[PDB]
Amino acid sequence: MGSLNLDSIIGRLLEVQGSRPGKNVQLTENEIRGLCLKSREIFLSQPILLELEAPLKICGDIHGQYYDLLRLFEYGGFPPESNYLFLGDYVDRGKQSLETICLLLAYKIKYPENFFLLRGNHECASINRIYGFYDECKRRYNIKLWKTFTDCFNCLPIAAIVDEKIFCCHGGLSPDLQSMEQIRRIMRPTDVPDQGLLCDLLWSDPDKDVQGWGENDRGVSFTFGAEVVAKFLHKHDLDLICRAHQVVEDGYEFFAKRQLVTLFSAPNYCGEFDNAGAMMSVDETLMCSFQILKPA
């Protein structure tokens, strides 16, 4: 005992759609614990390297901007009308990390074969301790719930391949990534290490000025140039890298002659940027199109 009243939880999460943005949904602690526990089971039963098929919609960082998450579903179609892949960074920086991750977990549980969540670098206790999620849990619930989230985040998948052609991850490529089997061998639960394959997948960035690999300004992981992308795509017979992790003005931005695209789905990020958010739709023929969300 007991079951999880998923439909009531989702109904309450969706209730505030159209209300003055910022209006909270305060689930019970056990409801949220239920969401973490049941989704954690689902994450572990599915591969850490997801293998997905189009059509699906792909979204980048949300960062607790819950009403922008709802807008994405509004324009993209609420599950299960459309399949979704999110590229991580659900929490921190925004005002409503809790509503955000809870709706995502809820949909993961309700539609486990049509709804998918990758791990971002903010789905990591050492990071979201600092940038808001801990403070939000502590304020609205307790630190024990925050540790329950950590335990759940530690089981998220870290990459996805869509129809053997699009490689998806939060950050980018790794100098340790030589085979896809190296990703599949990563055991869960796990924290995000300070270095290595898992770290790079959640932390690395493309860089125009770097030929091969370079030092990353974040002080973690690496930057990789257009050449690194071309070699990677050719080696694994892929057409595109789809990642997130960086705020871009129009919500999406191409790199290396459209061989890589960055998606960022949190419009006016932190209230400091004037960026749009974007969502990429991939149809059954792997035609990719962008919906852009201008900030409210």
Binding site: R71, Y75, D163, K165, I166, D239, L240, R258, A276, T285, L286, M287, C288, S289, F290, Q291, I292, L293, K294, A296
Partner: peptide
């Protein structure tokens, strides 16, 4: 033999 292609039809969503 499917290949990734990009639509030039971009949809923008505003709030009036």
């Amino acid at each position: 033999a499917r290949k990734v292609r990009f639509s030039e039809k971009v949809t923008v969503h505003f709030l009036a």
